[PDB]
Amino acid sequence: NPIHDRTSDYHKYLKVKQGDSDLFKLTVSDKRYIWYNPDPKERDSYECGEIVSETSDSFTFKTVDGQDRQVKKDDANQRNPIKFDGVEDMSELSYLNEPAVFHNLRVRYNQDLIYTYSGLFLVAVNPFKRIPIYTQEMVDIFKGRRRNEVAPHIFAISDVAYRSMLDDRQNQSLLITGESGAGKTENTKKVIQYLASVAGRGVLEQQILQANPILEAFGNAKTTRNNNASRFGKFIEIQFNSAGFISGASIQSYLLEKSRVVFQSETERNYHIFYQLLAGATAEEKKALHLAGPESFNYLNQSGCVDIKGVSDSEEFKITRQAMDIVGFSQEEQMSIFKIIAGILHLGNIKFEKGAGEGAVLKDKTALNAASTVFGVNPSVLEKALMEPRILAGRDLVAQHLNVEKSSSSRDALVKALYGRLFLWLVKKINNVLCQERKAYFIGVLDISGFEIFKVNSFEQLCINYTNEKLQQFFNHHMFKLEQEEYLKEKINWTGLDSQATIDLIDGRQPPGILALLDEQSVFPNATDNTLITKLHSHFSKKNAKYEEPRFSKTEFGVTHYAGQVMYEIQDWLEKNKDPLQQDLELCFKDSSDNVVTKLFNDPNIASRKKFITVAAQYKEQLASLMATLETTNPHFVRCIIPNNKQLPAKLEDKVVLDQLRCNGVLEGIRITRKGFPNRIIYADFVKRYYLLAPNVPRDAEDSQKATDAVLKHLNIDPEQYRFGITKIFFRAGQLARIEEARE
Ligand SMILES: [Mg+2]
Incomplete structure (x- = not known):
């Protein structure tokens, strides 16, 4: 039994190595240490100081290069005694200050122990290298084992959730969040691997497992922080019958980054699928789709990167096509998907030119025609819908001749709409195969970003930070409920309202919050960035304690989030909220001869947000349905953490790590605990x-x-x-x- 065999891979990879003896005497020492900042401007860089004497209210200690400092007992971060180094749960530490928490993580990370509990959380630190702890043999060890019988692992929280589902007869959720590159998607895949094995058996399990490469081909991309970045959030429901066997699955996706189709920053790529297709298509597909190399398409030749080190796009194309076969996309469906992908690249090569007063005309029709052929649309109808859309202006419907720049923006809007709708169609198609109208129970897995606080923050950052306000409030209430149960059950008397102001500033109706004011501006076609930011300042500047009007910037505003202040810039939010597409373009593609493309435009479930609503209103409603579902579940929380910003192994950086622990609720949870x-x-x-x-x-x-x-x-x-x-x-x-x- 690997849990008791100290030579096993289990012991080597998941446990602190145990010696011949664990006796108290081995760890005796008369040295006492403190964690201190060598530089007080660096709050989260510490070194270890030996306490050399004390007074009634201070310690005196020796710093690492021999200098005497002193610190008030009340301000001191004492270092845990050595027996505590490596413990599997931070809740086992006696001194619970920040550097003591970081130290225990780092001790474990130094031994490649990347999983560590902190009370209710599983903290998972990306090793940035392969550790062989996810084999079938490793799966089998965790089967049936309580959290306190086996080492920390994503498999163990997966088993505790599965047993709780079977024992309490209660749906479960695993919320897996954290920064880009932290490992959320991989951990999400391990939870699905684990459940398919403990609860499977089959063709359905295979289909559930193959859903993933399909959505990654279409929704992941190389960014500067992750070679395989998820640019959509997801909530996967793994469904069970009442005997506890997998019966189905369902996927909800969120915030797909449609703008990446038309623009990538330097060294980044477009979605994987575009490179896969080009690399992997047969000569006969290439000619039928009119494809060349990525250097020949504006949508793939701007970033300077078309390859990912260690990745073969043609081998991945094979994997994606095999996944599609297995889920059961027909050969004709697959061809039409590839036709849509090829047609987007063709759209991006249309070059608009001035032909007189502006104008915009197409002198070479080759890209237009290629696109039109592959999409099954009329190129003369496409041409006019792009450059001369008919616009309602009072009671008159008149064709307005767009200039090159508006023609080019409209073409970009068309591409983003085709891409977004295709992605939603793919999700629905997979759901149609996997989803059981009659599940008895489910375990839901959320794989989304935690708080996003970049150099620039825009509408999509406010959305995901609004989501994370809700999820942190949910965790707080959960933590409060479970602590009081624990004390009650042991008969001990000891004795997220906080988050509501920020949430109300974002989503309030009366008085109106930010999204309500955004939505109001959205019915006025001539409203601008300035009219919107002005309205926001008029309502909230010096009037709402979570908002800040900047000293100087005229286009930004600040929200005090759980994770600290975030500055947002409002450029283009009015456009983002409406996501407009000319009606003549809808009309063009509504008459497509392609059986997939017609759905993207004629099925209102795909073609439109529901009835009339804005993008913000839809985001608010999808968040409220998600929260409603999570509140019916017993939740489990996994916080993925990146060790540094360089995608390197063996380099756990205190300032990078501690900043995430402050943002993601771990340090606050401990401060309340302690x-x-x-x-x-x-x-x-x-x-x-x-x-x-x-x-x-x-x-x-x-x-x-x-x-x-x-x-x-x-x-x-x-x-x-x-x-x-x-x-x-x-x-x-x-x-x-x-x-x-x-x-x-
Ligand atoms: Mg991911």
Whole structure:
């Protein structure tokens, strides 16, 4: 049994290596240390100082290069005794200050132990290298094991959720969030791998597993932070019958980055599918789709990057086509998907020219025709809908001759609409195959970004930060409910409203919040960026404590989020909220001869947001349905963390890491925890380690509570620092570290 065989891969890769002995005496030391900042302007870079003496309210310590500093006891970050280095749950630490939390993570990360609990959270730090802990053999170890019987792992939280589903008869959710490159999608895939194995058996399992490469081909791209970045969020429901076997699955997607189709920043790529197609198509597909190399398409030849190191786009095309076969897209469906992809690239090569007054005409029709052929549309109808759309102006419908720039924007809008709708069609198609109208239970997995705070923040950042306000509020309420249950159950008296202001500033109706004011401006076609930002300042500047009008910028505003202030710029929000596409372009493509393209334009479930609503209103409603579903589940929270910004292994950077722990709720959770009784230990466990600290207890004394009390009395510990629970002693912060340091 690998859990008990210390030579196994389980022990080597997931545990701190255990020596011949764990006796208290091995770890005895008279040194006491403090974590301190060598430079006080760097709040989260620490070094270890040896305390050399103390007064009533201060410590004096030696810094690393020999200099005496002093610190008030009340301000000190004491270092946990060495036995605590490597513990599997931060809730086991006696000193719970920030550098002590970072130290335990780093100790573990130094041994390639990338998973560590913190109370309710599983903290997962990307190793940026392969560690072989996700094999079938590794799956089998976690089957049926309680959290406290096996090491931290995404498989163990997956098993606890599965058993809770079966035992409590309650749907479950796993919320997996964090920065780009942190590992969320890979962990999401491991949860699905795990459930398919413990609960599967089959062709349905295979289809559920193959849904993923399809959506990654279409919704992931190389960015500067991740070679395989997800540019859409997702919520996957894995469905079960009441006997606990997988019966189905459903996928909801969110915030697909449609703008990447038409523009990529330097060294970034477009969506993988465009390179796959070009690399992987047969000679006969290339000629039928009129394809050349990526250097021949404006939508793929601007960033300077068409290749990803270690990735073969033609081998990935094969993988994507195999996935499609297995889910059951027909050969004709697949061809039409590739026709849409090829036609977008052809659209992007249309070059608009001035032909007189502007004008915009097409002198070479080759790209127009190629696009028209592949989409099944009339090129003369496409041409006019692009450059001379008929516009309603009062009661008159008149063709307006657009100039080159508006013609080019309209073409871009068409491309983004084709891409967005195709993606939604793909999701619906996969759902039609996988989804069970009659599931008994589900485990839902959310894989989305945590808070996004960039150098520039725009409408999509406000959306995902609004989502993360809700999810952090949900976690807070959950944490409050479970802590009070724990204290109740052990009979111990100790005794997200916070998030509501920010949420109301964003989504309030009366008085109107930011999205309501955005939506109001959206019915006025001549409203501008300036009219919108002015309205926002008029309502909130100096009037709402979570908002800030900048000192100087005229296009930005600040929101105080859970994770700190975010500055947003409002350029183009009015356009983003309406997502406009000329009606003559809808009309052109509504009459397509292609059986996929017609759906993108004639099925109102795909072609339109529902009835009339804006993009913000739809985002608010989809978030409220998501929250409604999560509130019916027993949730589990996974916080993925990136160790540095360079995609390098073995380089865990304190400032990068701690900033994420502050943003994602981990440090706040600990700060709240550490105030009550954070260490709660099964009496027999306590006795088993500490019996030699007192006379006449019996390492296995049958009366565990009494023997615990014997040691506490013998050491004369202040009774205010502990509480006897029905099954555990509860300790205030620091107390257990002082017991660990007592004399044998
Ligand atoms: Mg991802």
